[PDB]
Homo-oligomer: 86 residues x 4
């Protein structure tokens, strides 16, 4: 059972992680890289320019089996019950 | 326009851009992105997610660096009353 | 009561307890804590914060473990429409 | 300039940390331990019991010089521009 620092390194290397203390079961978080995509309308082209850079982010597979954008809570940050998920 | 977050949230859900006077970075705004469903790209993805992936709606921020971050309001964001709609 | 977060937020600011049907833990609720000002406890604290410390209002969660966590809504919390006032 | 994992260890040891990439200047975050306090009214005594345990948390000294409860953003989590603050 790892602290968040080790779970973070795991995330950045492409692994999945979860916490034993989470109330929902079978969930995991994972890293998604950033990228660039093309502005497709002049309305979007005006707001964001011709091509748009987006930052990397983290995602969570929820108990509903859909994907949420995810930010650890302070309890998640401070916990030492993280595990890498196969 | 000095809106509270409830009114900024209604604006977000209606597809408008919002920002706060009290943010330290300037020229930023947040906006809503709908959820959806994409087919799994690789067999390694299929082994974890199945054939399809449903993703929830989320919020995005156009940052001072003019790139796009995923965004969740801070507590100070949530409690503030200096929100405005951005054109 | 199937409130959106704007209505749950109004309730929080009025001093009520709120929770979500869609939370995984049960029997939890969030509530508002006002800001304030406390004198600095030690000289080491005074060297960093001065004589007084002003702290902002914040939100708290009574967890399944029945202890109190500081709390910030998730994006799913913010976008949900299954909020209720708790007695 | 550290990643968040090292900034987290610093926090847990009682140090102050900040990020070079923060828009506001002169800010820092720090760790606050948990504790117990007594329920003072029967209204509170009924809701939370006779004595209340509260978890540790993180705080931020903001540009307004007041203290906010603080959760790192995903950009904070993923950044590698953390520094310990004297
Ligand atoms: N549908 C969804 N969309 C977006 N994110 C979702 C999600 N479902 C789960 N997550 C995220 O996955 C992690 C653990 O999931 P889980 O513990 O099952 O969450 P829950 O029971 O529904 O929490 C009820 C309230 O307490 C917050 N919270 C603060 N720390 C915790 C962990 C643990 N309980 C503890 O106390 O240490 C919870 C939480 O955000 C919510 O407002 C956590 O990052 C959580 O945000
Ligand atoms: N009064 C206050 N109450 C409570 N927490 C406060 C606070 N003031 C600052 N903080 C916290 O201190 C950290 C850095 O402070 P700062 O960067 O100056 O925040 P800002 O410019 O006002 O952000 C405008 C929007 O973008 C979010 N955001 C996401 N990552 C970042 C960092 C950096 N910009 C990046 O993009 O990597 C910002 C941010 O939450 C807000 O919704 C950050 O954890 C932030 O939440």
């Amino acid at each position: 059972s790892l602290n968040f620092g080790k779970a973070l390194e795991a995330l950045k290397e492409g692994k999945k992680v979860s916490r034993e203390g989470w109330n929902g079961k079978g969930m995991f978080a994972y890293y998604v890289p950033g990228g660039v995509y093309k502005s497709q309308t002049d309305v979007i082209k005006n707001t964001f320019g011709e091509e748009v850079k987006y930052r990397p982010y983290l995602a969570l597979k929820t108990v509903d089996n859909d994907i949420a954008t995810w930010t650890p809570s302070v309890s998640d940050i401070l916990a030492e019950d993280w595990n890498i998920v196969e």
